[PDB]
DNA sequence: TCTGACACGTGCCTGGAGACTAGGGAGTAATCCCCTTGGCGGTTAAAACGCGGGGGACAGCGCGTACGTGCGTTTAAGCGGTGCTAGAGCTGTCTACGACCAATTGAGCGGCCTCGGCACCGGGAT
DNA sequence: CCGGTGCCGAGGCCGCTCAATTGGTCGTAGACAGCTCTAGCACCGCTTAAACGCACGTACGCGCTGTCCCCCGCGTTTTAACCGCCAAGGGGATTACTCCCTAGTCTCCAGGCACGTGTCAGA
């Protein structure tokens, strides 16, 4: 009871490209801890990066700079290209 | 462009292969081998800004125009809403010399495009801001290596073509 | 509709915002930061899921076993540079040999 | 209260042999099985002690999977699939 | 022929993903190591397998680098000096 | 201007055991960054340690557990023995 | 009479408490936590300063140079394990040689 | 002791060398080589609780007393206000057998001290809870290795003296 | 403009660093490999420092920014902040 | 002559790598990430004291990699393994 | 024998300390099960031991080639001293954006069937 | 791998507490704006340590061989690892309430920061 995992969202984002591929519960917990560790890494990097500028808030630029810090190479470029597209489709409404 | 207030005159055109397609948000997947390309055309006239194009822009302190040869463009960086690494040109203070110096162009300077080749402008030789090493090579030989190969080797390619 | 439906994403914006507020990362939290974070980790989950699906389709299997996730992470260069200090449950080892042995 | 008198010998020599065949080793010397078990003891003496201090911070008496995965997360040996 | 079923065992254990280290001796080892830190301390059964997976992925990463140090030294067998170097090259 | 360091406290704790030994300003900045790195290490350990039990109050128990997690060997054994001996004199007054 | 004098230490308890409040490490902070961190910071600084003074006395110098601090750190065992991923500027390297050279 | 409510009957005696001194807060410095020792005597009668002493305490479930031979004591741990690793003894269910099993004793159980040697109690042989391997060695031979050497080697010393 | 500046650090400087490391003899083919190691190392550290500076809307990489970038990479430098 | 140079460069704490080549090197590397980007005068010295520490920590371990293989002169394959084993 | 940076009184001002309030989070007691541990049979899959051998490990050697070292020789590195100027770090407004307080509600976390792709066999070529 | 049961485990289906969402409202930290001054860049020059070569012996890298011995591998014994199953028990949850302890806000003041001139290292 009251375990906020990432099971159904990962299962939904799997089936939107490869709908004929199942996923085990152990691999589901692996991906849950995977996105939880990436969330903890980006959140701690944004916390330290907002502390380094004497700021009190975390905007989208803070998380964008922290995720360009953490992820290496072209994957970070594709990640920020996805994130900026999503926030421009979100906020412009 | 600098920010989203200046990014209201361009859109993201994400060509997957050498053909011109979009296929959603950058193929919806990150795919190696098939290196994606992005040239952003304005909706007023459709002027392409691609990897290897020569754009014209007035300088921030001079006022006299200058040509920038685009080496790379990175979508949605941190300080800018899109970054653009372009090779500079040498002003005669109409023949324009080539320069392998990278710089960044903003959207409030770019006016028109001009494919500067040898005989609206005329290239003579690749040169340097030091003032020597004139190598009479046009831009048609390096644009294929720019468009086909990532610029991590094309930087050393046009650096070795000089000197 | 929720903020995830307004963003065009399938990952929870409000859960990430609640975890950011309860994780003691800052006193204040901007508006674009949780939707940017959900977009980033949604893209990361989608990429690791499609690479695991490619590893499963290269084994003629459908259910993604953790061995498929290991062989999908270690075969990619930038994911292995990202997950350099990781240990995956039931992953084994890469199929790898050196030329100075055979 | 079990008399586990040097159970580091419980990791027997074909177990280190199987681990080396997984790692890609053709043949092993005979003066290695005494050393690899000492390396394992020195590694577990760090990570188990970190997990014990983690689980006795919370006034508990069970070492759960969250405790060992947090102790491995702090040591730069981040395990997945448990929390 | 000598030295060809070792490559067969390598090909068997590289395609597989099972647990090479046994469960109960490793459990007794973890218990006798934590015996010096807390008496009557019980372990969750998931945590013992978690420690076993971390030990296995640490030991095969040590053994791959040890075999690489032996290969660079123009040998195919490993010695104690290789693992001494690999511990002094990884803290 | 108005940038707080630990210079005077390090100088005072040096001048009560080795009173005839000076200290350079470069070594002063080295020791200041050293104790600042240890402070942020113990703070970021106690933050994640209080997050693991769903608490919101860092106490002496949390910092003592984090500093026996960070400092290795008998150095932590002398450190917590000094810390408890100091906080008993503090809270006993 | 003050808080640091009531603790009996030479390190600021109030600055530690203010930095703990402003550093986003928790929502609430107990009483014993900043004085415990003050005590352990004072102990660590006192030990590293005693070892640096030992290096300065064994090198016939009256001021702590960074070479004295790096020799004091790398000559100790547990301080080197605490500061393994630490590179000190203007300090060079620990003097050691291999027997097979 | 468990907490500070039960730690009001003992004080920290920090002997630097083999002689009995205090010299402030653990020599005011951490010194290698000269390994510091701590035996905590109660102010009622001055009964020493040292590294190698045999204390008597009633069990938490049995009620019948038991002897604990102190192997190590660690000042100001996390759960307890001071931790004490002591070797257990075998009850005859008056001769007492030795046991190399570590355990932890709390302050609400300890009553008196008794130097159990061979012929208030009498030791016969080191044994085990399995019920065999009787090695007729008294406690006088191991207390010197306990007091002189850190217990990381004394554990393997009395483990190798058995079996 | 700036090109082949990795040959500015020369093989006697690598000889000095190797004598500080404690070698007796080195090869003549290790210099390009040491330059290739240093290139990737300074590339990662300079890229992290540039990210830290470009976050703060600055146009000058500070010593505090580069010591934060070295702290994040597990190579915590002292004496600068 | 050799071990005298080890004893000299192992006791003194001078700047081994030169200042202005290191300046031009970090400027050439940073020019691919931000053009017309300035550097603090303490930041380049911090980069030098970190780079010459990492290189010495690499060299003092590839010397162990050389003497592990019963040889004195190091090789490119020594430092390749010395970086590849931990980085 | 020389001098050139490091350390004791110096006004202050602004951050630390005391006091007086509530509110809210931990800390005592309290169920009750949801996980362990443990000791029983069992049976068998690796583990242990012994020998054969043969192929790699170590050691000596001899041809030799790349490398430390010695001595010109450029030559670019280090210090200084300019000028200048780009931007870091301030103060000041205010403003736009987030925290916090009720209301609501779909949603996304738990039960519950309902099938369905992987296992490992005969045995067949891998 | 054909393919057959089967199985046990994920996939839809239902479904109901509850935290995500909306709406005002206040309040408060960042965004512009100036400034200013400060630390960093360029450049010329002046010495000047030192990188850059050529020889040159020479000493270790490296290939060959030769011995030898130690571990790979097989065959027999053996023994405890895995399974499982029942049973006991004990500690990890989750109320609960309360209480005391700490955030907030004044409140007073003092302490520890920036100079600074007297004083103490190096060559």
Residue numbers in the entry:
A (entry chain H), F (entry chain D): 35 to 127
B (entry chain L), H (entry chain K): 2 to 94, 130 to 155, 170 to 213
C (entry chain G): 16 to 117
D (entry chain B): 19 to 101
E (entry chain A): 42 to 132
G (entry chain C): 16 to 116
I (entry chain F): 21 to 101
J (entry chain E): 46 to 132
Text lifted from the article:
Orc1, the largest subunit of ORC, is responsible for Sir1 recruitment via direct interaction through its Bromo Adjacent Homology (BAH) domain. In addition to its role in binding Sir1, Orc1^BAH^ has also been shown to bind the nucleosome. Orc1^BAH^ was previously shown to interact with the nucleosome core particle (NCP) in a manner dependent on acetylation of its N-terminus. Here we show that nucleosome impedes Sir1 binding by Orc1^BAH^, indicating the need of a suitable chromatin environment for Sir1 recruitment in yeast cells.
To evaluate the potential impact of crystal packing, we determined the Orc1^BAH^-NCP structure by single-particle cryo-electron microscopy (cryo-EM). Complexes of Orc1^BAH^ bound to NCP at 1:1 and 2:1 molar ratios were observed, and their structures were determined at 3.5 Å and 4.0 Å resolutions, respectively ([Fig fig2], [Fig figs3], [Fig figs4] and [Table tbls1]). (A) Left panel, 3.5 Å cryo-EM structure of one Orc1^BAH^ molecule bound to one side of NCP; Right panel, 4.0 Å cryo-EM structure with one Orc1^BAH^ bound to each side of NCP. In both structures, the NCP densities are well defined, and that of the BAH domains are weaker. In particular, the densities for the Sir1-interacting H-domain and several peripheral loops of Orc1^BAH^ are poorly defined. Improvement of the EM density with refinement of the masked volumes enclosing the BAH domain allowed unambiguous docking of Orc1^BAH^ with NCP. Nevertheless, the density for the H-domain of Orc1 still cannot be modeled, and the same is true in the crystal structure, as only one of the two Orc1^BAH^ molecules bound to each NCP contains partially ordered H-domain, indicating dynamic nature of this region in solution ([Fig fig2] & S2). In the structure of the Orc1^BAH^-NCP complex, the H-domain is mostly disordered, indicating a dynamic but accessible protein region for Sir1^OID^ binding, while the β4-β5 loop is well ordered. Orc1^BAH^ itself no longer binds the NCP with 20 N-terminal residues of histone H4 removed ([Fig figs6]). These findings point to the cause that the movement of the β4-β5 loop away from the Sir1 arginine residues by ∼ 1 Å due to NCP binding creates a setting that the β4-β5 loop and the H-domain cannot coordinate the binding of Sir1^OID^ ([Fig fig4]). Structure comparison shows that in the presence of NCP, while the H-domain is freely available, the β4-β5 loop is displaced with respect to the core of Orc1^BAH^, rendering a nucleosome regulated interaction with Sir1^OID^.
